[PDB]
Design a binder for this molecule. Structure first.
Ligand code: APC
Ligand code: CL
Length: 451
């Protein structure tokens, strides 16, 4: 049961100082920082109000932090000749990648890209893909990765939701997506567009569904908030990450930016889906130091490609409930391997919580999802939005720096899931309703139960 879906006493619409809208049950106290803009009304009536009024999701003390491309730029200045990307037998240095992305960024500016502009990127995995998305960020826009493994009808639909007036693609992919002004990625100082951390960096669309497109629109701050100042993996110039996760959803960022923001190497896997045998070969070839793997992929590699973990420093299972026996076996086979369980919705960006595996876990029936990343929060709430007592079952709501702005072109859906945070201080903040059931145990660690 959930009071944002079914509530006895009807609903109201709340807004904060940044013009963001939240659905809210009428019988529950209004959180600090929020004011009633509409209602009491029926749920459908509240949602209609939101659809009509909330026409721009972007929010309307100086912002802390550099943007994603700015941190990349500093790494490119620090070590222009360090290797940034590896793909098949080819390598691309930080310096060369920065120069290519600059050339393309200047082209984007001439075509009208500005802060607040979105740009579709329809490219197979390889250097051009990274040149293109960095170029979009540098020009101050947000990118949306259009994964070419998907049917064009679905890609076209997603692109339409974003409203992007520009598409970057390749000569071989030319003509698949039509009706949007298109430029070609095939090939230079840094730009200074005034873009900031609350500006949109990306819109993500899931690789794992055939339902109606849902574009998660997230600011630079949500990316940097997930990869900087964290300790769930090793970050630094001596790391070698492997970009094998689907390019258009949220696991992509850790692999690509977790490397580029730090001066590390990023190996790009050929093919749009994680390829277990190729992963094993790439780890051996390049000395990959961190793997991020969905649980099913993790379990297969542990059982059938054990050499994929040789030399690897951190492996993190995610996306679905971890298999304790496979985590245990990984530990037996690779004693120096640090193991983690990473949890979260794309709406809160990459990992919202993380659990470092300890010996005492390896005999359990389930692996805990751990504690929130620095700057992020997780609540376990009952259907009155009251925290669950210790060990009691409740629903997970997540909050803090990873939160997306919402779902592009879908303000009603955004307002029913990104809702007011009733625990936050004077400033109004939001929390995202995950739909996941969990328990918090005495020591504060979170246990995923399911849906
Ligand atoms: N480490 C982990 N352990 C268990 N479950 C996990 C997990 N990491 C992710 N999940 C599950 O996978 C989900 C990932 O969230 P998302 O990718 O945002 C789902 P979505 O595509 O937005 O669709 P939905 O929320 O409408 O189902 C989590 O909500 C959780 O159910
Ligand atoms: Cl150098």
């Amino acid at each position: 049961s959930n009071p944002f879906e079914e509530y006895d006493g009807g609903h109201v619409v709340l807004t904060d100082a940044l013009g963001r809208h939240s659905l809210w049950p009428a019988g529950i106290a209004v959180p600090a920082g929020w004011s009633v803009r509409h209602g009491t009304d029926s749920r459908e009536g509240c949602l209609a109000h939101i659809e009509h009024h909330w026409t721009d999701l972007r929010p309307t003390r100086a912002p802390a932090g550099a943007c994603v491309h700015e941190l990349f730029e500093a790494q490119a200045a620090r070590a222009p000749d360090a290797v940034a990307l590896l793909h098949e037998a080819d390598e691309l240095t930080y310096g060369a990648l920065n120069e290519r992305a600059n050339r393309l960024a200047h082209r984007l500016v001439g075509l009208g890209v500005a802060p607040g502009t979105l740009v579709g990127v329809h490219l197979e995995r390889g250097f051009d893909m990274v040149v293109a998305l960095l170029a979009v960020l540098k020009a101050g826009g947000g990118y949306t990765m259009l994964d070419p493994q998907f049917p064009v009808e679905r890609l076209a639909l997603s692109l339409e939701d974003t409203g992007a007036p520009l598409l970057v693609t390749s000569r071989p992919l030319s003509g698949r997506l039509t009706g949007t002004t298109t430029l070609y990625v095939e090939d230079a100082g840094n730009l200074a567009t005034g873009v900031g951390p609350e500006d949109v960096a990306c819109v993500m669309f899931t690789s794992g569904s055939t339902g109606r497109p849902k574009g998660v629109m997230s600011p630079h701050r949500a990316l940097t908030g997930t990869y900087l100042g964290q300790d769930y993996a090793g970050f630094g110039p001596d790391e070698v990450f492997l970009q094998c996760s689907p390019v258009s959803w949220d696991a992509f960022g850790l692999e690509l930016f977790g490397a580029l923001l730090f001066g590390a190497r990023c190996v790009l896997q050929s093919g749009q889906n994680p390829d277990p045998l190729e992963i094993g070969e790439l780890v051996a070839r390049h000395g990959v130091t961190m793997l991020q793997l969905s649980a099913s992929l993790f379990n297969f590699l542990v059982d059938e490609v054990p050499e994929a973990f040789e030399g690897v420093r951190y492996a993190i299972t995610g996306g679905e409930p971890a298999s304790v026996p496979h985590v245990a076996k990984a530990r037996r086979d690779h004693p120096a391997l640090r193991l983690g369980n990473g949890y979260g919705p794309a709406e809160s960006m990459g990992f919202t919580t993380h659990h470092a595996v300890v010996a005492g876990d390896l005999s359990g029936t389930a692996l805990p999802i751990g504690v929130p990343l620095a700057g992020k929060r997780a609540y376990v709430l009952d259907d009155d939005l009251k925290p669950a007592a210790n060990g009691a079952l409740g629903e997970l709501y997540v909050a803090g720096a990873g939160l997306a702005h919402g779902y592009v072109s879908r303000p009603a859906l955004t307002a029913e899931r990104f809702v007011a945070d009733p625990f936050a201080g004077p400033g109004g903040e939001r929390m995202y309703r995950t739909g996941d059931l969990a328990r918090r145990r005495a020591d504060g660690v979170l246990e995923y139960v399911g849906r």
